[PDB]
Coordinates of all heavy atoms in Angstrom, one line a residue:
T1 N 5.8 -8.7 -13.9 CA 5.7 -9.4 -15.1 C 6.5 -10.7 -15.1 O 7.1 -11.1 -14.1 CB 6.1 -8.6 -16.2 OG1 7.4 -8.1 -16.1 CG2 5.1 -7.4 -16.4
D2 N 6.6 -11.4 -16.3 CA 7.4 -12.5 -16.5 C 8.6 -12.1 -17.5 O 8.8 -11.0 -17.9 CB 6.6 -13.7 -17.2 CG 5.7 -13.2 -18.4 OD1 5.7 -12.0 -18.7 OD2 5.1 -14.1 -19.0
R3 N 9.3 -13.1 -17.9 CA 10.3 -12.9 -19.0 C 9.7 -12.6 -20.3 O 10.3 -11.9 -21.2 CB 11.3 -14.0 -19.2 CG 12.4 -14.0 -18.2 CD 12.1 -14.8 -16.9 NE 11.9 -16.2 -17.2 CZ 11.3 -17.0 -16.4 NH1 10.8 -16.6 -15.3 NH2 11.1 -18.4 -16.8
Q4 N 8.4 -13.0 -20.5 CA 7.7 -12.8 -21.8 C 7.2 -11.4 -21.9 O 6.8 -11.0 -23.0 CB 6.6 -13.8 -22.0 CG 7.1 -15.2 -22.0 CD 8.2 -15.4 -23.1 OE1 9.3 -15.6 -22.8 NE2 7.7 -15.4 -24.3
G5 N 7.2 -10.6 -20.8 CA 6.6 -9.3 -20.9 C 5.1 -9.4 -20.9 O 4.5 -8.9 -21.9
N6 N 4.5 -10.0 -19.9 CA 3.1 -10.1 -19.8 C 2.6 -9.7 -18.4 O 3.3 -9.9 -17.4 CB 2.6 -11.5 -20.1 CG 2.8 -12.0 -21.5 OD1 2.6 -11.2 -22.4 ND2 3.3 -13.2 -21.7
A7 N 1.5 -9.0 -18.3 CA 1.0 -8.5 -17.0 C 0.5 -9.5 -16.2 O -0.2 -10.4 -16.6 CB -0.1 -7.4 -17.3
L8 N 1.0 -9.5 -14.9 CA 0.4 -10.3 -13.8 C -0.3 -9.5 -12.8 O -1.4 -9.8 -12.4 CB 1.5 -11.2 -13.2 CG 2.1 -12.3 -14.1 CD1 3.3 -12.9 -13.6 CD2 1.0 -13.2 -14.4
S9 N 0.4 -8.4 -12.2 CA -0.1 -7.6 -11.2 C 0.4 -6.2 -11.3 O 1.6 -6.0 -11.3 CB 0.2 -8.2 -9.8 OG -0.3 -7.3 -8.8
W10 N -0.4 -5.2 -11.5 CA -0.1 -3.8 -11.5 C -0.7 -3.1 -10.2 O -1.8 -3.5 -9.8 CB -0.6 -3.1 -12.8 CG -2.0 -3.1 -12.9 CD1 -2.8 -4.1 -13.4 CD2 -2.9 -2.1 -12.5 NE1 -4.1 -3.8 -13.4 CE2 -4.2 -2.6 -12.8 CE3 -2.7 -0.9 -11.9 CZ2 -5.3 -1.8 -12.6 CZ3 -3.9 -0.1 -11.6 CH2 -5.1 -0.6 -11.9
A11 N 0.0 -2.1 -9.8 CA -0.5 -1.4 -8.6 C 0.1 0.1 -8.7 O 1.4 0.2 -8.9 CB -0.2 -2.0 -7.3
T12 N -0.7 1.0 -8.4 CA -0.3 2.5 -8.5 C -0.5 3.2 -7.2 O -1.2 2.7 -6.3 CB -1.2 3.2 -9.6 OG1 -2.5 3.1 -9.1 CG2 -1.1 2.5 -10.9
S13 N 0.2 4.3 -7.1 CA 0.1 5.1 -5.9 C -1.3 5.8 -5.7 O -1.6 6.0 -4.6 CB 1.2 6.2 -5.9 OG 2.5 5.5 -6.0
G14 N -1.9 6.1 -6.8 CA -3.2 6.7 -6.6 C -4.3 5.7 -6.3 O -5.3 6.2 -5.7
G15 N -4.1 4.4 -6.5 CA -5.1 3.4 -6.1 C -5.1 3.1 -4.7 O -6.1 2.5 -4.2
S16 N -4.1 3.5 -4.0 CA -4.0 3.3 -2.5 C -4.7 4.5 -1.7 O -4.7 4.4 -0.5 CB -2.6 3.2 -2.0 OG -1.9 2.1 -2.6
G17 N -5.3 5.4 -2.5 CA -6.1 6.4 -1.8 C -5.2 7.6 -1.2 O -5.3 7.8 0.0
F18 N -4.5 8.2 -2.0 CA -3.7 9.4 -1.5 C -4.2 10.7 -2.2 O -4.7 11.6 -1.6 CB -2.2 9.2 -1.7 CG -1.7 8.2 -0.7 CD1 -1.5 6.8 -1.2 CD2 -1.4 8.5 0.6 CE1 -1.0 5.9 -0.2 CE2 -0.9 7.5 1.4 CZ -0.7 6.3 1.0
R19 N -4.0 10.7 -3.6 CA -4.7 11.7 -4.5 C -4.4 13.2 -4.1 O -5.2 14.0 -3.7 CB -6.2 11.5 -4.5 CG -6.6 10.1 -4.9 CD -6.2 9.8 -6.4 NE -6.9 10.8 -7.3 CZ -6.5 11.0 -8.6 NH1 -5.5 10.3 -9.1 NH2 -7.2 11.8 -9.3
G20 N -3.1 13.5 -4.3 CA -2.8 14.9 -4.2 C -1.3 15.2 -3.9 O -0.4 14.7 -4.6
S21 N -1.1 16.0 -2.9 CA 0.3 16.2 -2.4 C 0.8 15.0 -1.7 O 2.1 14.8 -1.7 CB 0.4 17.5 -1.5 OG 1.7 17.7 -1.0
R22 N 0.0 14.3 -1.1 CA 0.4 13.0 -0.5 C 0.7 11.9 -1.5 O 1.3 10.9 -1.1 CB -0.8 12.6 0.4 CG -1.1 13.6 1.5 CD -2.3 13.2 2.3 NE -2.1 11.9 3.0 CZ -2.7 10.8 2.7 NH1 -3.5 10.7 1.7 NH2 -2.5 9.7 3.5
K23 N 0.2 12.1 -2.7 CA 0.4 11.1 -3.7 C 1.9 11.0 -4.2 O 2.4 9.9 -4.5 CB -0.4 11.5 -5.0 CG -0.4 10.6 -6.1 CD -1.3 11.2 -7.2 CE -1.3 10.4 -8.5 NZ -2.1 11.0 -9.5
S24 N 2.7 12.0 -4.1 CA 4.0 12.1 -4.6 C 5.1 11.7 -3.6 O 6.3 11.8 -3.8 CB 4.3 13.5 -5.1 OG 3.4 13.8 -6.1
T25 N 4.7 11.3 -2.4 CA 5.6 10.9 -1.4 C 6.2 9.6 -1.5 O 5.6 8.7 -2.1 CB 4.9 11.0 0.0 OG1 3.9 10.0 0.1 CG2 4.2 12.4 0.2
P26 N 7.5 9.4 -1.0 CA 8.1 8.1 -1.1 C 7.4 7.1 -0.1 O 7.8 5.9 -0.1 CB 9.5 8.3 -0.8 CG 9.5 9.5 0.0 CD 8.4 10.4 -0.6
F27 N 6.6 7.6 0.8 CA 5.9 6.6 1.7 C 4.8 5.9 0.8 O 4.6 4.7 1.0 CB 5.2 7.4 2.8 CG 4.3 6.4 3.6 CD1 4.8 5.4 4.4 CD2 2.9 6.6 3.5 CE1 4.0 4.6 5.1 CE2 2.1 5.8 4.2 CZ 2.6 4.8 5.0
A28 N 4.1 6.6 0.0 CA 3.1 6.0 -0.8 C 3.6 5.1 -1.9 O 2.9 4.3 -2.5 CB 2.2 7.1 -1.5
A29 N 4.9 5.2 -2.2 CA 5.6 4.2 -3.0 C 5.9 2.9 -2.3 O 6.5 2.0 -2.8 CB 6.8 4.8 -3.7
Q30 N 5.7 2.8 -0.9 CA 5.8 1.6 -0.2 C 4.5 1.0 -0.1 O 4.4 -0.3 0.0 CB 6.4 1.8 1.2 CG 7.8 2.1 1.2 CD 8.4 2.0 2.6 OE1 7.6 1.8 3.6 NE2 9.6 2.1 2.8

């Protein structure tokens, strides 16, 4: 975001295609 608190780019662990026990790993947070 910016200092104004406005969205520029969001990205989630489920959107990278893990979806399960692999979803909660700290690798998928990279």
Side-chain angles (χ1 to χ4, degrees):
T1 57
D2 55 355
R3 276 90 65 196
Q4 300 304 110
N6 292 320
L8 291 172
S9 176
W10 62 273
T12 63
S13 299
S16 299
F18 291 97
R19 300 296 298 166
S21 177
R22 300 172 64 249
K23 182 182 177 182
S24 301
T25 63
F27 173 71
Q30 286 190 358

